[PDB]
């Protein structure tokens, strides 16, 4: 328990200006404004077509290995998916020398697409696949995940060895990479601020990282349209805002940096 206090964007810019090692922890909220709804019970969305108990779990993968591919294929094919202003904002915060890493539960790759340089993919990334017999790695790109691609023609996709391909994403019931976790833990151990943006922090991966940050007594700021499981438990502050409103923080800190003008 902690008495989390609400603050403004300008107050957040103020906090960041003093920091030397800022880390972000991100969830589906940051891709919300990239046309992937975060609320999975939304009936007017892709998630309505698909049973999460199947496509989202490792049991579901072995029973119906086509489904998570169909899901990835449909989101990729049916929606326009570009970096939003949150991403550009996080990208400038690294440029200005504040943001040192983004630890993410998202598998869409948008942080890197915006130019972030140390994105730790705790749940993996939809642009890689592995044969779940021989462990061969195949690199994919957006054009390969389209419904019209040859790679998508037969699902699940098949490996020359005879095994099938599985996306390189961590499903519910699977175990997060212990070398990636250690990377995320050493980032938090060295940070002087953790931004927890667009996540409920109810998945073990997030909850445990936030616990770790309290253990190492790091200052924790939520940026989210809502309070969350860690409000009044783990975060010191909360900015009530959409991820994309982070351009205001980036604009403040960018303006202030332009003190390169002699005088």
């Amino acid at each position: 328990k902690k008495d989390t206090q609400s603050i403004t964007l300008e107050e957040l810019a103020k906090i960041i200006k003093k920091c030397k090692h800022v880390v972000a922890l991100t969830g589906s909220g940051t891709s919300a404004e990239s046309n992937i709804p975060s609320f999975r019970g939304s009936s007017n969305s892709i998630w309505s077509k698909y049973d999460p108990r199947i496509y989202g779990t490792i049991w579901g993968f072995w029973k119906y290995p086509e489904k998570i591919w169909e899901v990835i294929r449909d989101i990729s094919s049916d929606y326009e998916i570009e970096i939003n202003n949150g991403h550009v904002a996080l990208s400038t915060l690294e440029s200005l020398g504040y943001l040192k890493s983004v630890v993410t539960q998202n598998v869409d790759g948008l942080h890197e697409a915006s130019g972030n340089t140390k994105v730790i993919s705790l749940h993996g990334n939809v642009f890689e696949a592995v044969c779940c017999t021989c462990n061969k790695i195949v690199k994919l790109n957006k054009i390969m995940l389209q419904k019209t691609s040859h790679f998508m023609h037969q699902l699940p996709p098949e490996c020359p060895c005879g095994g099938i391909f599985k996306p390189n994403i961590i499903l519910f019931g699977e175990v997060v990479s212990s070398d990636l976790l250690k990377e995320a833990e050493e980032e938090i151990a060295k940070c002087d601020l953790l931004l927890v943006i667009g996540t409920s922090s109810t998945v073990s991966t997030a909850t445990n990282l936030c616990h770790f940050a309290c253990k190492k007594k790091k200052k924790i700021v939520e940026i989210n349209i809502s309070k969350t499981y860690i409000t009044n438990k783990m975060s010191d502050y909360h900015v009530c805002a959409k991820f994309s409103e982070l351009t205001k923080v980036a604009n403040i800190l960018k303006g202030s940096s332009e003190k390169n003008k002699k005088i």
């Binding site: 749940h123 499903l171 519910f172 019931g173 175990v175 997060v176 109810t202 998945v203 991966t205 445990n208």
Partner: peptide
């Protein structure tokens, strides 16, 4: 165990 779970 850093199992992904709700």
């Amino acid at each position: 165990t850093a199992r992904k779970s709700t």
